[PDB]
Amino acid sequence: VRKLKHHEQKLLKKVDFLHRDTQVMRTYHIQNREDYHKYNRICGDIRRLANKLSLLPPTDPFRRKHEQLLLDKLYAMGVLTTKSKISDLENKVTVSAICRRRLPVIMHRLKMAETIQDAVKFIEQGHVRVGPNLINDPAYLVTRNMEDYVTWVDNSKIKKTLLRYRNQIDDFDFS
Amino acid sequence: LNDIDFNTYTSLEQIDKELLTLSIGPRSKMNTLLHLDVIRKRSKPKELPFFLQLSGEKVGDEASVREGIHRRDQEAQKKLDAEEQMNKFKVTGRLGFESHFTKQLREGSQSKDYSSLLATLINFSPAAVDLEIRSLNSFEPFDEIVWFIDALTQGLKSNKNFELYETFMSLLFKAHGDVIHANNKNQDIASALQNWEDVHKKEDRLDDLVKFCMGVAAFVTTA
Amino acid sequence: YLLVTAGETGWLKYHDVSTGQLVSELRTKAGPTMAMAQNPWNAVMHLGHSNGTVSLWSPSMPEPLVKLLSARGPVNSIAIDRSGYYMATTGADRSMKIWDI
Amino acid sequence: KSDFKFSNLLGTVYRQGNITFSDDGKQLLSPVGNRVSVFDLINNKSFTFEYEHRKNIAAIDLNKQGTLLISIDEDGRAILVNFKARNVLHHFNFKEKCSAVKFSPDGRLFALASGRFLQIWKTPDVNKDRQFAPFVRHRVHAGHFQDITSLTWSQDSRFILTTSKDLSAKIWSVDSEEKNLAATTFNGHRDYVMGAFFSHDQEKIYTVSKDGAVFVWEFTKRKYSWRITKKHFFYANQAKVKCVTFHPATRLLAVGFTSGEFRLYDLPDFTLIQQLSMGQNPVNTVSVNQTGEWLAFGSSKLGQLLVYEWQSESYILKQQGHFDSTNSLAYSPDGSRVVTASEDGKIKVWDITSGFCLATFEEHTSSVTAVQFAKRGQVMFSSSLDGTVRAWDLIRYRNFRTFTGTERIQFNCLAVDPSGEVVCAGSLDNFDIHVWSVQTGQLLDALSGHEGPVSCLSFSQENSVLASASWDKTIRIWSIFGRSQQVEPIEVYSDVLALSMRPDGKEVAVSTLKGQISIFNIEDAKQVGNIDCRKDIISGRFNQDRFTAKNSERSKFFTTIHYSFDGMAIVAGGNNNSICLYDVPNEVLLKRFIVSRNMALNGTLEFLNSMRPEVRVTSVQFSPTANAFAAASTEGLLIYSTNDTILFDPFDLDVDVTPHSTVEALREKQFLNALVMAFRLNEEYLINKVYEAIPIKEIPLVASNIPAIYLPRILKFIGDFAIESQHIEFNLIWIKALLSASGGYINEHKYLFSTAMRSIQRFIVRVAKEVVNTTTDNKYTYRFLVSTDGSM
Amino acid sequence: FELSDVKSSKSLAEIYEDDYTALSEELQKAHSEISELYANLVYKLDVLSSVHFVPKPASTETPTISMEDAQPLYMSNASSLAPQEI
């Protein structure tokens, strides 16, 4: 409030109702603080499922089947890559894993756009499509197979210019 | 020609006397009638003492075990519940002794013509129809059953509401089949059922027609 | 430094706003509080219920410091002198009262 | 043939707002998202109003004389409509959000609870010709302090009770003199007020709270006024009254709480007639028949609607619409049933002729993705993301089997052999068409050869082949029977994503991502012709978009195609707002319907007026009766139909063929000529008249001499009439005479009489074998009950 | 299993009443809870990774009605059984 002085700090050391969230904001450019909190709460949900299923008797067909269901569904979502572990589930499911699964980051590693902000600008301007249908909101976690079948929308200036540079434009497809 | 001038035409009730017709109404009523009871059964909703009295195995009395030596309670409690609703509904409104349906049947018997009875029977609601047919009477003289049989036979002669008359007959056989079978060979009921059978063996041509049409239709469309 | 949020489930919460911690949380057995005003000579909250009763609350203990029967029906509004000496209550049975607090 | 009216809506029997009964008590009006569904109870039918609104309907009401219907959405936009013709008369704009509407039991005027003002309008005359501005105010009152939460008229139309969140209930009068009489308030009451009612004699006023308190006020003495004669209480744990209704002529109070409990009480003595729990979600609306016998309950969370009869404890109807969105559709091989699969796994079987829900199936877990029948009345297969293809009966209503792969792989599309013996399912994580056997169960094999997910499959039901189409920009025609296992790959220009097949079994129609519906001949593996679709598609804009609704390819293609059963027409639908009806042989569009005008749904505005529910058609089909077609979309199962036939569509007329001439032909007894002229005119009433005119002893001659051009039309008419006509052996003599006189012709051109024979056999199967089966049962019962010896 | 070396909360009277009066009710409690919270999780993830709107699946005595019924409501189980299996 005023960077209050030494003695008044000592009297009031805790009166401020006014930074990993911001660190990720800068490193992988996630959209908002509520977004980051969402990812954290997701990770906590997974953790608590692990704890309660472990509390369930390990020698139970129900518990073991539900464990395999959960782990397979997570693998299909592509947050993680392995299948043979559970301590993997308790440790490496991270806001980092989810945010690298985020679409513009997928565009960047798959190399659609050179930067995360350019990727998000392209999503806004409506140039990408996943399978048939296109995507407008960056906060779109792409499944394994779908992220494998991402590419541009047709007849967009971006694809036209790419092909022009390659000198492989082909107006029959009205590329 | 007024139908012409308004370019709209209404279907005739019944084309001719020899022509079977159906009830002017839904086709679901037959199924609902024939399967009303099971609908009820599937549509019912879903739902200490100070001195205990324990046994020689439950407590440590294996000696009495080695020399080893509530349904009626639930029946009593069920009786009690029955009493409870029985005196919970206590409306003393003044209602006629003889119900409209059974009365109307009675003067129909008196006049030997059941037209009004058939009219009201068709106008009933399915739950009602089942209720009254189940709650007929089976005393010695069998008058009510004989009259109802006569009414149904008269209707089948009328050649209208063919489906509902057959299904009413089947409902009667469902409910009071036991008594009619038991006191079979009693002359009055025998005569009534014989008239009914006469009309029905007259009508079997419909079965013939349906079987022919189906056989030919399948043959043409798949061969 | 205290934020008082009376509402409809019938409930009164003192939220310290500097440190940011819900100081107190007192249920009112009365009902949806109709009006509300603070005595500033005293800093005690006057709620006005649907019974026709004003009730004086303080964040320390979970029972009304005091209760007054102002009007019949509900109490639309209550306002308090700056000296905390006089109060005016208006109740939807076309009634108005001036009270010596 | 190319005209369709929106005739029905299946699924979502109740979405939001007031539920009402009709005057006669024979009809229940429910508000679905935009429109109003009418359920006719005694004749077991349904119906849906053609007009829509702009947003969700928030309140309805029916004039007591059963003529007018006011319906108001959430912004004062009100539409006043007629019934006996089903047309929109006017639409006015009450500017604040309405909360409730009521027609005074006289009918002269109606009141309107909006916010905290009471508004009272007169109501327009119907017999009056369409005026320009017919709405006129009658009074406005503003005595409240918060929202007017419920309303009630008196039996005489002179007094209005309004209950408001101010914790109060007000008696207003309609006149000034009676204002002087009773302009009175009602205070002294706990949490909220949720209903107020006059008694039968109107000296007692009941007020029902929200906490669960009932107050009986009664104009008694301590120069005296409105004491609180008695207090009754419900006692629910924490449940709270959500909606109340009071039938005065039998003193019923039906109350529905928020826990899903609802109770019926007899009021003055206040006894608990009964109490039931409809579900774990709040009961949201209540109403009572006038004769006091039927209770209607609506719960919004699942979209579930109940009509109960408490006298006899019998459920007149108890339906619950889908929750999420009808993902896919299938018609029964004769046309009676329609099975729809949600995004939940709920697979519901509806009956058409009475728009009801015969059954549900829940054995799936994740979203169902495709549903299909056999060429038989027995079975039905479903495919879900569960990783399973499940085979159900429909006579016992139970799973035969759960086909599945090996790695629990999700299945996008399904197809089934005509013989019902082989089941094919195409995934998206594997792009191999897995093929199971029906009777054995263990999967035969994996037809491989695509690359990239297998978009769709279907079987030619004459050569019994299958075309499988994939995002590999390719179609692949497999013959998989008899020693060969032979493949044939065709290429399209871009990602095929929908497929369908000529009923004769010679051509495929595939919609790709450019939006061109190409059409191929199979045996030649060549392209007969394509139909562009890019320009005749009305996409929708998104409020969260940065671009236009034209220059975006958001839904510029068709994800669902289906043929007609003459093989001449195509219906198409996609993620767009439009359902386009093309025709094959001449490559043009016949019609384009707009699925919904509802600005709440996202892609519905073309230009915005200066995450969210989008509108999309997930799957379309024609009807095997070819008089109607259904589209399963985000808002349910829309069903367009032709069963109006208000249209002069004559055929090969000539100057001397007039209705009067037809009547003269009847009088002069050339029945053949009369029938021929009747069809040449092609008018339903004249056809009906002559058809029921001609006599039995002459039907065979006519059936002999009908011309071969008119054989198909007569067969079709007879079928579509004999369903809902009661002259059975009239129709059956007719059909028998027709088949007898002309059978060989039909056998030689079976593909031309397909729908005709389908309808005929549907009539005979569904409503002739039933009568004869009951007849047989009675005949045998009588034989046995007479023949055997008695008891004892 | 394991014994309880803590003092028993209910005396002989009560334990004999208990002996006087699905495996473990606690087991079904935990099962139901984990099922609900897992439904919540899959909801969250489908919202994140789908393309089309998906609604919150649901919310989570006295006689109850059953609105779903996987039979036509007029079919008797005697008629849904097949002769081989009876």
From Swiss-Prot, chain A:
Disulphide bond pairs: none
Gene Ontology MF: a single term: RNA folding chaperone
Domain S4 RNA-binding stretches: 101-167
Superkingdom: Eukaryota
GO cellular component: 90S preribosome; Mpp10 complex; nucleolus; nucleoplasm; small-subunit processome
GO terms for biological process, alphabetical: maturation of SSU-rRNA; ribosomal small subunit biogenesis; rRNA processing
CDD domains: S4
Signal peptide (from-to): none
Keywords of the record: Nucleus, Ribonucleoprotein, Ribosome biogenesis, RNA-binding, rRNA processing, rRNA-binding
Keyword RNA-binding assigned: yes
Transmembrane listed as a keyword: no
Subcellular location: Nucleus, Nucleolus
Main subcellular location of this protein, as a coarse class: nucleus
UniProt family annotation: Belongs to the universal ribosomal protein uS4 family.
Biological function: Required for the early cleavages at sites A0, A1 and A2 during 18S ribosomal pre-RNA processing.
Description of how the protein assembles with itself and partners: Component of a heterotrimeric complex containing IMP3, IMP4 and MPP10. Interacts with MPP10. Component of the ribosomal small subunit (SSU) processome composed of at least 40 protein subunits and snoRNA U3.
Protein's recorded name: U3 small nucleolar ribonucleoprotein protein IMP3
Protein species of origin: Saccharomyces cerevisiae (strain ATCC 204508 / S288c)
Gene: IMP3
UniProtKB/Swiss-Prot annotation, chain B:
Localization per Swiss-Prot or TrEMBL: Nucleus, Nucleolus
Recorded superkingdom: Eukaryota
Keywords: Acetylation, Nucleus, Phosphoprotein, Repeat, Ribonucleoprotein, Ribosome biogenesis, rRNA processing, WD repeat
Modified residues (Phosphoserine): 64
GO biological process: maturation of SSU-rRNA; rRNA processing
Gene Ontology CC entries for this record: 90S preribosome; nucleolus; nucleoplasm; nucleus; Pwp2p-containing subcomplex of 90S preribosome; small-subunit processome
Domain remarks: The WD repeats are grouped into two tandem seven-bladed beta-propeller regions.
Self-association state and partner proteins as the record states: Interacts with snoRNA U3. Interacts with MPP10. Interacts (via WD repeats) with UTP18. Component of the ribosomal small subunit (SSU) processome composed of at least 40 protein subunits and snoRNA U3.
Extra information: Present with 2020 molecules/cell in log phase SD medium.
Role this protein plays: Involved in nucleolar processing of pre-18S ribosomal RNA and ribosome assembly.
Protein name: U3 small nucleolar RNA-associated protein 21
Record lineage: Eukaryota, Fungi, Dikarya, Ascomycota, Saccharomycotina
Parent-protein start and end of this portion: 702 to 939 of 939
UniProtKB/Swiss-Prot annotation, chain C:
Subcellular location field: Nucleus, Nucleolus
Mapped WD repeat ranges: 28-67, 70-101
Assembly information from the UniProt record: Interacts with snoRNA U3. Interacts with MPP10. Component of the ribosomal small subunit (SSU) processome composed of at least 40 protein subunits and snoRNA U3.
Function (record text): Involved in nucleolar processing of pre-18S ribosomal RNA.
Miscellaneous note of the record: Present with 5800 molecules/cell in log phase SD medium.
Protein name: U3 small nucleolar RNA-associated protein 7
Species this protein is from: Saccharomyces cerevisiae (strain ATCC 204508 / S288c) (Baker's yeast)
Lineage, top ranks: Eukaryota, Fungi, Dikarya, Ascomycota, Saccharomycotina
Gene name, Swiss-Prot/TrEMBL: UTP7
Parent-record interval covered: 203 to 303 of 554
Curated annotation (Swiss-Prot), chain E:
Protein family per UniProt: Belongs to the MPP10 family.
Transmembrane residue ranges: none
Protein name, entry field: U3 small nucleolar RNA-associated protein MPP10
Top-level lineage group: Eukaryota
Subunit structure: Component of a heterotrimeric complex containing IMP3, IMP4 and MPP10. Interacts with snoRNA U3. Component of the ribosomal small subunit (SSU) processome composed of at least 40 protein subunits and snoRNA U3. Interacts with the SSU processome subunits EMG1, IMP3, IMP4, KRR1, NOC4/UTP19, NOP1, RPS4A, RPS4B, RPS6A, RPS6B, RPS7A, RPS7B, RPS9A, RPS9B, RPS14A, RPS14B, UTP1-UTP18, UTP20-UTP22 and UTP25.
Subcellular location: Nucleus, Nucleolus
Residues of the full protein shown: 398 to 495 of 593
Role, per record: Involved in nucleolar processing of pre-18S ribosomal RNA. Required for the early cleavages at sites A0, A1 and A2 during 18S ribosomal pre-RNA processing.
